Each structure stands twice: as structure tokens, then as C-alpha cells.
Amino acid sequence: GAQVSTQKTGAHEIHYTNINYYKDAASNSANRQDFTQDPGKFTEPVKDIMVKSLPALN
């Protein structure tokens, strides 16, 4: 019941071990490898989206 994933190392210069022990999900370790983002609902909160080339509400 092992899980192997890459460590966090920098660019231009691994495969650790994770075994889930306790019988719950509140004992699972902190998911500190979620790098996902989408600034599409804090920027561009709009209908009729801009083009950046048109004069943008001319």
C-alpha cells in the first residue's frame, strides 16, 4: 500500500515513500504540493470579455 511521488527540488539541478497509517482522513498528511491556480474569477470577472487589442469599451 505504498505511494511514490517526486520531491520538491529546484530547476536545472527523489521519489520518496508515503504509507497511510491511521484509519481516518484527518490523520493524512498536509497536501503541500497543490500548485494549481486560475485568476479567472478575481481578474476578468466580466461578461463580454476584453481582447487587450480592441479599445475595451470604446
Partner 1 sequence: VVRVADTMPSGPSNSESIPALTAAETGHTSQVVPSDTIQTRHVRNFHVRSESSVENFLSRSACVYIVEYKTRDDTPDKMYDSWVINTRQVAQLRRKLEFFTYVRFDVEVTFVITSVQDDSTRQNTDTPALTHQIMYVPPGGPIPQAVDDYNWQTSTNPSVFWTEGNAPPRMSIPFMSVGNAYSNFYDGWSHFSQTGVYGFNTLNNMGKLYFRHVNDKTISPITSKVRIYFKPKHVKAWVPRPPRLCEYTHKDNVDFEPKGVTTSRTQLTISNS
Partner 2 sequence: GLPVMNTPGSNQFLTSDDYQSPTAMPQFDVTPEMNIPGEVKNLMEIAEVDSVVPVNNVNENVNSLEAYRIPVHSVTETGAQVFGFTLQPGADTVMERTLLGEILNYYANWSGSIKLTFMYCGSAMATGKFLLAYSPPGAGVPKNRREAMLGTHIIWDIGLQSSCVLCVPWISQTHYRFVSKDIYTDAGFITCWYQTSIVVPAEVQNQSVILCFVSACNDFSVRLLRDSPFVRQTAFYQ
Partner 3 sequence: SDRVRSITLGNSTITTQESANVVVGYGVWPDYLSDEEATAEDQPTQPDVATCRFYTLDSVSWMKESQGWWWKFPDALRDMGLFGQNMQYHYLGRSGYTIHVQCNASKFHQGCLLVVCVPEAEMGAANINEKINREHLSNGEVANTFSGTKSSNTNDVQQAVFNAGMGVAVGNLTIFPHQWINLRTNNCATIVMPYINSVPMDNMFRHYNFTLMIIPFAKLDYAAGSSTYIPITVTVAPMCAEYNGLRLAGHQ
Interface positions with a copy of itself (CB under 8 A):
1-2, 4, 7-9, 14-17, 19-25, 28, 32
Helix (H) or strand (E) holding 2: strand 2-5
- Round to whole Å and give the CA distance between 5 and 7: 7
Write out the residues near partner 1 by the rule CB under 8 A: 8, 10-12, 24-32, 34-37, 42-46, 50, 52-53, 55-57
Q: At its nearest, how many Å lie between partner 2 and the CB of residue 58?
A: 7
Contact between 8 and partner 2 by CB under 8 A: the answer reads yes
Residue 19's contacts (CB-CB under 8 Å, 6 or more residues apart) are 1, 2, 3
